[PDB]
Amino acid sequence: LGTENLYNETEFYAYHIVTRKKMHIGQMIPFNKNQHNTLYHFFFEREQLNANGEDGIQILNNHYKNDELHINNENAKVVISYMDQTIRAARETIVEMVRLQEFPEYPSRLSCLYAAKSYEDALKWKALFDSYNREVLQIVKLRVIGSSFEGDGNLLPKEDGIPFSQKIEQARKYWKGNNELPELLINGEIEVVEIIDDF
Amino acid sequence: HHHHSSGVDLGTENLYFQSAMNETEFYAYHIVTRKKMHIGQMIPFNQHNTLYHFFFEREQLNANGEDGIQILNNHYKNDELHINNENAKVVISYMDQTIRAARETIVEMVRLQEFPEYPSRLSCLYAAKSYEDALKWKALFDSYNREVLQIVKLRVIGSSFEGDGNLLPKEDGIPFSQKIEQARKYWKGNELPELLINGEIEVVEIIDDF
């Protein structure tokens, strides 16, 4: 009392497959202050341009003439890559917008670590990475003080050209939840408490 | 989050005690292009607007029922993308609408993040601050071959935001993170203002029938 600053986050374990760089026990991974993740940098920050510094939109409009669109080589490559990146960025933007509207309590897919609910689940995820030839360095146990969301990636909007309003319905179903094999979103303060296996 | 309850409401045992301190009442000016309005007409704003419908709901497919993305992918072969006629028109209109929908989605997301109090561009009505401003918007509409049927005076009970549209993300292919920065500038944004208005809207005067 007579005081000024007088004034949701739980403690739990999760399992994480390391691919990028090896983690050590006691390592902190902060997603408590809206830090951007690798997924954000990849779909929101990077871009591809042709040799003249033009992006997909610029190239498409430069070439649309006589109601015909004839693009080749690097120009076609830049247009397609631009479309693939942007539809994927739109996906994350729509999903994030839906979370802010109706599910503000869950971690953002743009500001979280991706993990599994159990070791068994981590092993199943590992089996999928392997069948895809995705290098796995470790499987690690994390202690979290923050929040999580168990999601079904299958429920996310697709990389198709359907109307945004239909993509919004899909994001809504994603956030409502499934069952299958969950992708856990986690945020807050994350500590590596154990290296289960070091491949 | 927390909100202040009025002393007057304490002790009552009703559930819906919402409402007032945040309402404004003001006049605005509106360019009518869709259908003529009349004196004393009321408009309601949890509702999507025409911009949401045209950018988010509407779509154009080819004769085979394919959207712009499917057409793009199924024509990208051995380093060539050769599209003709209706297929080309569909891809172009798809890209056109989609970069606009993306702009509106990014701007809405940022509004939700930082300015949740302002009206949404996806449900609001658009207005001019003064009759003088409405006239300049009108000349702009005439230049771009979109006929204005009326300039009407509105009385609003609700809220508004005075925005500078030049600050919105553009219809170009820059990275979304840069479009997000632009959306922040927009919502902060100190020209010829475009007012966003929501709440209870009433036509109190038809200044111009054209």
Tab-separated table of C-alpha atoms in Angstrom:
chain	number	residue	atom	x	y	z
A	1	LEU	CA	0.000	0.000	0.000
A	2	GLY	CA	0.837	3.677	-0.581
A	3	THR	CA	2.773	1.986	-3.389
A	4	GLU	CA	2.678	2.529	-7.176
A	5	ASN	CA	3.270	-0.549	-9.340
A	6	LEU	CA	1.011	-3.068	-7.588
A	7	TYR	CA	0.702	-5.289	-10.682
A	8	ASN	CA	-1.259	-16.392	-17.226
A	9	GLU	CA	2.256	-17.798	-16.991
A	10	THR	CA	2.720	-21.384	-15.890
A	11	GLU	CA	5.631	-23.673	-15.233
A	12	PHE	CA	5.900	-26.715	-17.476
A	13	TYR	CA	8.242	-28.982	-19.429
A	14	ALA	CA	8.493	-29.323	-23.210
A	15	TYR	CA	10.727	-31.166	-25.684
A	16	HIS	CA	12.588	-29.519	-28.538
A	17	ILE	CA	14.434	-30.845	-31.575
A	18	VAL	CA	17.642	-28.896	-32.196
A	19	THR	CA	18.687	-28.416	-35.838
A	20	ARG	CA	20.388	-25.000	-36.173
A	21	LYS	CA	23.021	-24.770	-33.408
A	22	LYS	CA	23.750	-27.046	-30.434
A	23	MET	CA	22.255	-26.038	-27.096
A	24	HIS	CA	23.820	-26.423	-23.646
A	25	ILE	CA	22.124	-27.087	-20.294
A	26	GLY	CA	21.171	-23.849	-18.530
A	27	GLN	CA	20.692	-21.951	-21.773
A	28	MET	CA	17.981	-19.283	-21.844
A	29	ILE	CA	15.660	-18.695	-24.826
A	30	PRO	CA	13.603	-15.538	-24.398
A	31	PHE	CA	10.197	-15.179	-26.014
A	32	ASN	CA	8.663	-12.889	-23.370
A	33	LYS	CA	9.071	-9.534	-25.100
A	34	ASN	CA	7.662	-10.365	-28.534
A	35	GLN	CA	11.072	-11.379	-29.940
A	36	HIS	CA	10.864	-12.365	-33.610
A	37	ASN	CA	11.702	-15.965	-34.445
A	38	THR	CA	13.361	-17.659	-37.446
A	39	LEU	CA	9.963	-18.139	-39.109
A	40	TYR	CA	9.334	-14.390	-38.972
A	41	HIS	CA	12.768	-13.449	-40.380
A	42	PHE	CA	12.296	-15.964	-43.204
A	43	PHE	CA	8.825	-15.089	-44.466
A	44	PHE	CA	8.684	-11.382	-43.439
A	45	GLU	CA	12.217	-10.015	-43.959
A	46	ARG	CA	13.942	-11.846	-46.782
A	47	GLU	CA	13.214	-11.253	-50.456
A	48	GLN	CA	14.525	-12.207	-53.897
A	49	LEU	CA	15.058	-9.676	-56.661
A	50	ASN	CA	16.206	-10.100	-60.227
A	51	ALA	CA	19.608	-8.711	-61.360
A	52	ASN	CA	18.044	-5.257	-61.943
A	53	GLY	CA	16.676	-5.099	-58.382
A	54	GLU	CA	13.055	-5.764	-59.262
A	55	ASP	CA	10.659	-7.829	-57.155
A	56	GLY	CA	7.936	-10.238	-58.315
A	57	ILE	CA	5.206	-7.581	-58.382
A	58	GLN	CA	7.379	-5.218	-60.444
A	59	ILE	CA	8.383	-7.952	-62.908
A	60	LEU	CA	4.768	-9.186	-63.370
A	61	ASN	CA	3.503	-5.683	-64.100
A	62	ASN	CA	6.430	-4.856	-66.435
A	63	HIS	CA	5.629	-7.950	-68.459
A	64	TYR	CA	1.850	-7.861	-68.563
A	65	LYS	CA	1.273	-6.311	-71.963
A	66	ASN	CA	-1.068	-7.183	-74.808
A	67	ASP	CA	-2.990	-9.273	-72.281
A	68	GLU	CA	-0.165	-11.792	-72.398
A	69	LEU	CA	2.407	-12.684	-69.742
A	70	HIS	CA	5.679	-14.141	-71.105
A	71	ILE	CA	8.371	-14.332	-68.435
A	72	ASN	CA	11.575	-16.367	-68.571
A	73	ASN	CA	14.621	-17.572	-66.640
A	74	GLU	CA	15.538	-15.420	-63.644
A	75	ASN	CA	12.445	-13.210	-64.082
A	76	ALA	CA	10.071	-16.243	-63.868
A	77	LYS	CA	12.119	-17.591	-60.956
A	78	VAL	CA	11.748	-14.313	-59.054
A	79	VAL	CA	8.011	-14.127	-59.738
A	80	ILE	CA	7.363	-17.680	-58.489
A	81	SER	CA	9.603	-17.328	-55.426
A	82	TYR	CA	7.893	-14.048	-54.658
A	83	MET	CA	4.446	-15.693	-54.883
A	84	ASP	CA	5.521	-18.688	-52.715
A	85	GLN	CA	6.986	-16.412	-50.042
A	86	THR	CA	4.081	-13.990	-50.002
A	87	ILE	CA	1.317	-16.570	-49.780
A	88	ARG	CA	3.215	-18.040	-46.839
A	89	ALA	CA	3.694	-14.588	-45.265
A	90	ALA	CA	-0.022	-13.880	-45.767
A	91	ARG	CA	-0.771	-17.154	-43.996
A	92	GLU	CA	1.184	-16.138	-40.889
A	93	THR	CA	-0.242	-12.575	-40.998
A	94	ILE	CA	-3.881	-13.803	-41.169
A	95	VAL	CA	-3.251	-16.366	-38.414
A	96	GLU	CA	-1.602	-13.682	-36.262
A	97	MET	CA	-4.456	-11.275	-36.885
A	98	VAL	CA	-6.947	-13.985	-35.820
A	99	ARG	CA	-4.959	-14.710	-32.651
A	100	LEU	CA	-4.997	-11.018	-31.747
A	101	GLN	CA	-8.771	-10.877	-32.315
A	102	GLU	CA	-9.973	-14.040	-30.593
A	103	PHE	CA	-7.094	-15.906	-28.941
A	104	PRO	CA	-4.802	-13.220	-27.449
A	105	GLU	CA	-3.801	-15.601	-24.639
A	106	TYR	CA	-1.807	-17.954	-26.899
A	107	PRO	CA	1.811	-17.571	-28.022
A	108	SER	CA	2.303	-15.899	-31.395
A	109	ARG	CA	3.630	-18.172	-34.173
A	110	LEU	CA	5.976	-15.245	-34.954
A	111	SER	CA	7.347	-14.984	-31.432
A	112	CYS	CA	7.681	-18.488	-30.084
A	113	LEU	CA	9.732	-21.638	-29.969
A	114	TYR	CA	8.302	-24.768	-31.648
A	115	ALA	CA	8.348	-27.863	-29.449
A	116	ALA	CA	6.680	-31.142	-28.612
A	117	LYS	CA	4.506	-31.976	-25.601
A	118	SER	CA	6.451	-35.122	-24.721
A	119	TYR	CA	9.630	-37.073	-25.458
A	120	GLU	CA	7.570	-39.651	-27.348
A	121	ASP	CA	6.225	-36.823	-29.524
A	122	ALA	CA	9.717	-35.409	-30.033
A	123	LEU	CA	10.740	-38.893	-31.259
A	124	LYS	CA	7.842	-38.957	-33.737
A	125	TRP	CA	8.796	-35.494	-35.010
A	126	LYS	CA	12.399	-36.730	-35.289
A	127	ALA	CA	11.251	-39.698	-37.384
A	128	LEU	CA	9.610	-37.246	-39.815
A	129	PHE	CA	12.674	-34.975	-40.074
A	130	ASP	CA	14.749	-38.100	-40.811
A	131	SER	CA	12.420	-39.338	-43.549
A	132	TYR	CA	12.941	-35.855	-45.052
A	133	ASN	CA	16.736	-35.880	-44.524
A	134	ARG	CA	16.495	-32.949	-42.106
A	135	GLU	CA	19.587	-32.895	-39.859
A	136	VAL	CA	18.829	-33.174	-36.129
A	137	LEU	CA	21.583	-32.316	-33.648
A	138	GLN	CA	19.840	-33.060	-30.352
A	139	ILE	CA	16.596	-33.651	-28.563
A	140	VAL	CA	16.355	-31.471	-25.471
A	141	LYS	CA	14.099	-30.996	-22.462
A	142	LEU	CA	13.036	-27.465	-21.619
A	143	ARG	CA	11.549	-25.910	-18.554
A	144	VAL	CA	9.188	-23.095	-19.410
A	145	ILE	CA	7.723	-20.222	-17.410
A	146	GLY	CA	5.187	-18.791	-19.791
A	147	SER	CA	2.531	-20.224	-22.057
A	148	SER	CA	1.864	-22.841	-24.700
A	149	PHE	CA	-0.545	-23.767	-27.476
A	150	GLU	CA	-0.936	-27.255	-28.959
A	151	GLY	CA	-1.656	-26.791	-32.627
A	152	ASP	CA	-2.464	-28.909	-35.627
A	153	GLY	CA	-0.460	-27.602	-38.602
A	154	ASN	CA	-2.982	-29.363	-40.836
A	155	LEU	CA	-5.557	-26.712	-39.801
A	156	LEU	CA	-3.508	-23.719	-40.945
A	157	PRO	CA	-4.454	-21.950	-44.193
A	158	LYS	CA	-2.800	-23.504	-47.256
A	159	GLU	CA	-0.524	-22.151	-49.939
A	160	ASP	CA	-3.449	-21.917	-52.366
A	161	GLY	CA	-5.151	-18.825	-53.750
A	162	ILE	CA	-8.500	-19.000	-51.965
A	163	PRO	CA	-10.117	-15.788	-50.617
A	164	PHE	CA	-8.591	-14.301	-47.450
A	165	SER	CA	-11.987	-14.547	-45.691
A	166	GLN	CA	-11.850	-18.328	-46.146
A	167	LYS	CA	-8.236	-18.315	-44.889
A	168	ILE	CA	-9.484	-16.453	-41.784
A	169	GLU	CA	-12.030	-19.256	-41.128
A	170	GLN	CA	-9.167	-21.793	-41.408
A	171	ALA	CA	-6.916	-19.825	-38.986
A	172	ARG	CA	-9.885	-19.754	-36.589
A	173	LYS	CA	-10.114	-23.565	-36.686
A	174	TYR	CA	-6.370	-23.731	-36.140
A	175	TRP	CA	-6.627	-21.683	-32.957
A	176	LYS	CA	-9.744	-23.576	-31.678
A	177	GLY	CA	-7.650	-26.716	-31.717
A	178	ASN	CA	-7.819	-30.308	-32.881
A	179	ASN	CA	-6.010	-34.485	-32.690
A	180	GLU	CA	-2.997	-36.320	-33.943
A	181	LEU	CA	0.555	-35.140	-33.278
A	182	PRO	CA	0.728	-31.618	-31.879
A	183	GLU	CA	3.081	-28.800	-32.695
A	184	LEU	CA	3.487	-26.972	-29.373
A	185	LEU	CA	3.876	-23.158	-29.465
A	186	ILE	CA	5.775	-21.943	-26.391
A	187	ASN	CA	6.698	-18.455	-25.138
A	188	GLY	CA	8.026	-16.734	-21.977
A	189	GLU	CA	11.269	-17.832	-20.338
A	190	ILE	CA	12.669	-21.111	-21.631
A	191	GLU	CA	15.564	-23.035	-20.107
A	192	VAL	CA	17.351	-26.094	-21.458
A	193	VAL	CA	17.320	-28.426	-18.443
A	194	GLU	CA	18.422	-31.625	-20.152
A	195	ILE	CA	20.012	-32.850	-23.372
A	196	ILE	CA	18.167	-36.143	-23.868
A	197	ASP	CA	20.253	-37.187	-26.862
A	198	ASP	CA	23.111	-35.585	-28.777
A	199	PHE	CA	23.132	-36.817	-32.388
B	1	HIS	CA	-6.844	-5.994	-18.942
B	2	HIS	CA	-8.651	-3.555	-16.638
B	3	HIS	CA	-11.335	-0.910	-17.029
B	4	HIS	CA	-12.947	1.593	-14.675
B	5	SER	CA	-16.456	0.885	-13.369
B	6	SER	CA	-18.654	3.839	-12.378
B	7	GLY	CA	-19.702	4.081	-8.708
B	8	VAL	CA	-23.316	4.444	-9.812
B	9	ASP	CA	-23.218	0.862	-11.216
B	10	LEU	CA	-21.875	-0.747	-8.017
B	11	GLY	CA	-24.317	-2.832	-6.023
B	12	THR	CA	-26.659	-3.434	-8.956
B	13	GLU	CA	-26.886	-7.107	-9.857
B	14	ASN	CA	-27.319	-6.851	-13.590
B	15	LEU	CA	-24.824	-8.491	-16.009
B	16	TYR	CA	-24.620	-6.145	-18.991
B	17	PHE	CA	-23.305	-2.877	-17.544
B	18	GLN	CA	-21.140	-2.002	-20.527
B	19	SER	CA	-21.378	1.509	-22.214
B	20	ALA	CA	-19.973	6.382	-22.952
B	21	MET	CA	-16.828	8.021	-21.638
B	22	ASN	CA	-15.199	7.050	-24.959
B	23	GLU	CA	-18.069	8.099	-27.319
B	24	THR	CA	-17.704	11.217	-29.421
B	25	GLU	CA	-20.372	13.137	-31.276
B	26	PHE	CA	-19.257	15.028	-34.334
B	27	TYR	CA	-20.140	15.901	-37.895
B	28	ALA	CA	-18.393	14.258	-40.872
B	29	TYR	CA	-18.663	14.464	-44.680
B	30	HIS	CA	-19.226	11.532	-47.007
B	31	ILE	CA	-18.841	10.871	-50.748
B	32	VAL	CA	-21.670	8.633	-51.979
B	33	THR	CA	-20.897	6.417	-54.999
B	34	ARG	CA	-22.930	3.245	-54.412
B	35	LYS	CA	-26.542	4.378	-53.894
B	36	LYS	CA	-28.096	7.726	-52.977
B	37	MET	CA	-28.797	8.362	-49.317
B	38	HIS	CA	-31.522	10.452	-47.710
B	39	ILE	CA	-32.121	12.829	-44.826
B	40	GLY	CA	-32.403	11.096	-41.434
B	41	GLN	CA	-31.077	7.761	-42.696
B	42	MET	CA	-29.217	5.630	-40.135
B	43	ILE	CA	-26.214	3.380	-40.780
B	44	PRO	CA	-24.774	0.790	-38.377
B	45	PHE	CA	-21.036	-0.008	-38.253
B	46	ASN	CA	-18.996	-6.210	-35.629
B	47	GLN	CA	-19.940	-5.575	-39.308
B	48	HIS	CA	-17.666	-5.856	-42.311
B	49	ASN	CA	-17.606	-3.166	-44.932
B	50	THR	CA	-17.423	-3.058	-48.728
B	51	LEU	CA	-13.615	-2.957	-48.761
B	52	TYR	CA	-13.502	-6.173	-46.744
B	53	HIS	CA	-15.990	-7.714	-49.165
B	54	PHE	CA	-14.111	-6.771	-52.345
B	55	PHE	CA	-10.617	-7.557	-51.045
B	56	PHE	CA	-11.320	-10.493	-48.746
B	57	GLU	CA	-14.418	-12.305	-50.016
B	58	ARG	CA	-14.704	-11.760	-53.763
B	59	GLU	CA	-12.644	-13.819	-56.166
B	60	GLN	CA	-12.189	-14.311	-59.884
B	61	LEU	CA	-11.444	-17.732	-61.345
B	62	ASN	CA	-10.734	-18.906	-64.882
B	63	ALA	CA	-13.247	-20.998	-66.894
B	64	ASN	CA	-11.751	-24.162	-65.447
B	65	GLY	CA	-12.343	-22.892	-61.888
B	66	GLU	CA	-8.659	-22.184	-61.167
B	67	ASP	CA	-7.379	-19.295	-59.063
B	68	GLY	CA	-4.307	-17.152	-59.817
B	69	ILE	CA	-1.957	-19.310	-57.768
B	70	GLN	CA	-2.949	-22.590	-59.381
B	71	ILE	CA	-2.655	-21.049	-62.834
B	72	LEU	CA	0.781	-19.628	-61.996
B	73	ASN	CA	2.095	-22.964	-60.782
B	74	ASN	CA	0.701	-25.122	-63.547
B	75	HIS	CA	2.176	-22.799	-66.188
B	76	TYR	CA	5.678	-22.601	-64.652
B	77	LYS	CA	7.598	-25.113	-66.749
B	78	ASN	CA	11.242	-25.544	-67.854
B	79	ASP	CA	12.239	-21.962	-66.835
B	80	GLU	CA	9.261	-20.302	-68.525
B	81	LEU	CA	6.029	-18.805	-67.373
B	82	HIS	CA	3.959	-18.252	-70.517
B	83	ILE	CA	0.361	-17.248	-69.769
B	84	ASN	CA	-2.160	-15.892	-72.252
B	85	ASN	CA	-5.612	-14.338	-72.453
B	86	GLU	CA	-8.024	-15.118	-69.623
B	87	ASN	CA	-5.405	-17.050	-67.642
B	88	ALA	CA	-3.201	-13.888	-67.662
B	89	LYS	CA	-6.092	-11.614	-66.625
B	90	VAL	CA	-6.904	-13.964	-63.731
B	91	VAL	CA	-3.324	-14.061	-62.411
B	92	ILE	CA	-3.047	-10.308	-62.649
B	93	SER	CA	-6.343	-9.556	-60.963
B	94	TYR	CA	-5.387	-12.134	-58.297
B	95	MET	CA	-2.038	-10.428	-57.617
B	96	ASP	CA	-3.828	-7.032	-57.675
B	97	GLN	CA	-6.510	-7.973	-55.138
B	98	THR	CA	-4.125	-10.008	-52.985
B	99	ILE	CA	-1.506	-7.302	-52.432
B	100	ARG	CA	-4.435	-5.031	-51.367
B	101	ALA	CA	-5.850	-7.680	-49.040
B	102	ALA	CA	-2.367	-8.162	-47.589
B	103	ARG	CA	-2.050	-4.420	-47.013
B	104	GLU	CA	-5.356	-4.414	-45.165
B	105	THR	CA	-4.457	-7.517	-43.149
B	106	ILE	CA	-1.076	-6.107	-42.072
B	107	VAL	CA	-2.670	-2.756	-41.151
B	108	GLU	CA	-5.390	-4.547	-39.153
B	109	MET	CA	-2.840	-6.710	-37.362
B	110	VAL	CA	-0.819	-3.643	-36.373
B	111	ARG	CA	-4.010	-1.887	-35.236
B	112	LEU	CA	-4.775	-4.868	-33.047
B	113	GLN	CA	-1.207	-4.841	-31.654
B	114	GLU	CA	-0.765	-1.164	-30.877
B	115	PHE	CA	-3.940	0.877	-31.485
B	116	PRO	CA	-6.869	-1.437	-30.576
B	117	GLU	CA	-8.961	1.648	-29.754
B	118	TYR	CA	-9.147	3.071	-33.305
B	119	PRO	CA	-11.779	1.921	-35.812
B	120	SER	CA	-10.846	-0.965	-38.149
B	121	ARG	CA	-10.439	-0.240	-41.890
B	122	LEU	CA	-12.426	-3.474	-42.404
B	123	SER	CA	-15.646	-2.362	-40.740
B	124	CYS	CA	-15.621	1.455	-40.609
B	125	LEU	CA	-17.066	4.040	-42.964
B	126	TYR	CA	-14.728	6.516	-44.699
B	127	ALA	CA	-15.303	10.250	-44.423
B	128	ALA	CA	-13.900	13.710	-44.941
B	129	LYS	CA	-13.254	16.049	-42.013
B	130	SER	CA	-14.759	19.125	-43.650
B	131	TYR	CA	-17.013	19.929	-46.580
B	132	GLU	CA	-14.001	21.637	-48.186
B	133	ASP	CA	-12.067	18.347	-47.840
B	134	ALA	CA	-14.998	16.376	-49.302
B	135	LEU	CA	-14.799	18.563	-52.425
B	136	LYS	CA	-11.142	17.720	-52.986
B	137	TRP	CA	-11.849	14.012	-52.543
B	138	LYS	CA	-14.656	14.504	-55.074
B	139	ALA	CA	-12.417	16.058	-57.732
B	140	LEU	CA	-10.069	13.126	-57.137
B	141	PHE	CA	-12.928	10.650	-57.748
B	142	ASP	CA	-13.994	12.447	-60.943
B	143	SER	CA	-10.423	12.260	-62.294
B	144	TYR	CA	-10.390	8.501	-61.768
B	145	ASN	CA	-13.736	8.018	-63.511
B	146	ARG	CA	-15.794	7.051	-60.439
B	147	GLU	CA	-18.953	9.132	-60.324
B	148	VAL	CA	-19.972	10.683	-57.040
B	149	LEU	CA	-23.736	10.765	-56.570
B	150	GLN	CA	-23.807	12.937	-53.439
B	151	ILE	CA	-21.826	14.668	-50.714
B	152	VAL	CA	-23.730	14.265	-47.451
B	153	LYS	CA	-23.297	15.478	-43.888
B	154	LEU	CA	-23.185	12.773	-41.261
B	155	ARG	CA	-23.673	12.996	-37.570
B	156	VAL	CA	-21.675	10.309	-35.784
B	157	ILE	CA	-22.001	8.907	-32.293
B	158	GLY	CA	-18.924	6.763	-31.898
B	159	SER	CA	-15.301	7.440	-32.795
B	160	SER	CA	-12.885	8.254	-35.598
B	161	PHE	CA	-9.278	8.254	-36.663
B	162	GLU	CA	-7.775	10.840	-38.957
B	163	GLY	CA	-5.417	9.012	-41.262
B	164	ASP	CA	-3.017	9.848	-44.045
B	165	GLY	CA	-3.451	7.191	-46.743
B	166	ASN	CA	-0.068	7.952	-48.327
B	167	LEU	CA	1.344	6.246	-45.199
B	168	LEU	CA	-0.371	2.852	-45.729
B	169	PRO	CA	1.738	0.022	-47.252
B	170	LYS	CA	1.782	0.293	-51.050
B	171	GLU	CA	0.832	-2.166	-53.749
B	172	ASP	CA	4.451	-3.171	-54.255
B	173	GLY	CA	6.433	-6.319	-53.483
B	174	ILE	CA	8.514	-5.194	-50.505
B	175	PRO	CA	8.950	-7.592	-47.525
B	176	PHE	CA	6.059	-7.755	-45.024
B	177	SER	CA	8.313	-6.497	-42.204
B	178	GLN	CA	8.704	-3.239	-44.139
B	179	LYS	CA	4.955	-3.109	-44.752
B	180	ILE	CA	4.455	-3.528	-40.977
B	181	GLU	CA	6.726	-0.502	-40.303
B	182	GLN	CA	4.621	1.541	-42.779
B	183	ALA	CA	1.408	0.453	-41.035
B	184	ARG	CA	2.884	1.769	-37.724
B	185	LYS	CA	3.618	5.136	-39.340
B	186	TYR	CA	0.057	5.178	-40.669
B	187	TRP	CA	-1.590	4.592	-37.282
B	188	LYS	CA	0.616	7.234	-35.636
B	189	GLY	CA	0.085	9.325	-38.558
B	190	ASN	CA	0.078	13.116	-38.418
B	191	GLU	CA	-2.474	16.520	-45.686
B	192	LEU	CA	-5.942	15.658	-47.031
B	193	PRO	CA	-7.109	13.334	-44.242
B	194	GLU	CA	-9.103	10.156	-44.680
B	195	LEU	CA	-11.293	9.737	-41.609
B	196	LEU	CA	-12.163	6.291	-40.360
B	197	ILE	CA	-15.501	6.385	-38.537
B	198	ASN	CA	-17.555	3.834	-36.621
B	199	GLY	CA	-20.562	3.892	-34.266
B	200	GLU	CA	-24.052	5.203	-34.967
B	201	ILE	CA	-24.123	7.202	-38.161
B	202	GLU	CA	-26.962	9.410	-39.347
B	203	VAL	CA	-27.428	11.464	-42.540
B	204	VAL	CA	-28.382	14.989	-41.358
B	205	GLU	CA	-27.954	16.814	-44.688
B	206	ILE	CA	-27.541	16.212	-48.393
B	207	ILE	CA	-25.187	19.052	-49.264
B	208	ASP	CA	-24.801	17.990	-52.893
B	209	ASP	CA	-26.853	15.888	-55.220
B	210	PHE	CA	-24.861	15.362	-58.410
